[PDB]
Each structure stands twice: as C-alpha cells, then as structure tokens.
Amino acid sequence: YDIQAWKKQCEELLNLIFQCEDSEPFRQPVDLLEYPDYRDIIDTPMDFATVRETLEAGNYESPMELCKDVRLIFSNSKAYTPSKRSRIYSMSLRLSAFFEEHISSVLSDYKSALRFHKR
Numbered sequence: 044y045d046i047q048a049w050k051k052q053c054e055e056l057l058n059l060i061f062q063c064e065d066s067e068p069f070r071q072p073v074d075l076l077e078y079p080d081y082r083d084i085i086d087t088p089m090d091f092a093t094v095r096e097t098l099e100a101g102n103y104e105s106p107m108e109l110c111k112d113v114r115l116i117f118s119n120s121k122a123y124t125p126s127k128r129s130r131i132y133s134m135s136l137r138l139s140a141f142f143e144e145h146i147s148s149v150l151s152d153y154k155s156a157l158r159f160h161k162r
C-alpha cells in the first residue's frame with residue numbers, strides 16, 4: 044500500500060523501454076528536417092526522453108498521468124503512419140504491448156494504495 048512506489052517502478056520500466064531496440068524511433072522528439080509535415084498532423088509531440096524527464100522533475104502526480112503521455116507516443120505514431128505495415132508503426136505496436144503488459148500492475152498497485160489510504 045506504498046502510495047509512492049509507482050515512481051521507481053516507472054523509472055525501471057522506462058529503463059527497460061530504453062534497452063528495447065523497438066524504442067529507437069521514440070527516444071527523442073521528431074526532427075522536422077527528416078519529417079517536415081509532422082506538426083501538420085501531430086498536435087502534441089511526445090517521446091520517452093520527455094516522459095523520463097517529466098518523471099525525474101517530479102512533474103507527474105500519478106502513474107496514470109505518465110501512462111497518458113506514453114500512450115500519446117503510440118497514438119502519434121498511429122496518426123503519422125502512412126501504412127499499418129510501416130516499420131516504425133510496427134515497432135510502436137510491439138513496444139505498446141510491452142508497455143501495457145508492464146504498466147498494468149503499476150496502475151493497479153497505485154490505485155489500491157490510494158483506496159487503502161482513504162479507507
């Protein structure tokens with residue numbers, strides 16, 4: 044029932060994600076010079092370095108907020124993909140499945156801890 048345990052759990056999961064080859068395209072913001080129409084399609088850029096920095100700054104209150112930003116990385120890739128068969132989109136779907144498999148217990152444990160706190 045540790046209300047703070049999510050933060051280190053999220054740091055560890057981000058470490059795993061940075062070790063995954065599938066995260067390569069999502070470790071920094073999209074350079075417009077490679078993809079000059081990116082901001083015509085994507086309203087809110089997001090990447091794993093921005094997520095880690097936000098976490099390490101103490102600017103997430105809950106793992107739900109972190110989860111919303113990570114899911115934005117994946118929705119941006121689905122919105123920007125010219126094909127569902129894209130290399131970089133296919134990497135996003137595998138990384139998304141890995142992230143969802145690992146974040147589920149982090150969320151469950153946090154929400155259980157908060158319910159216990161307010162019991």
Ligand SMILES: CCCCNC(=O)N1CCN(C(=O)c2ccco2)CC1
Nearest residue numbers: 068070071072073120123124129131
């Ligand atoms: C790590 C910094 C530079 C790598 N980032 C980058 O240029 N990417 C990632 C996001 N992109 C897509 O999700 C996508 C879908 C289909 C094609 O690209 C655009 C290309």
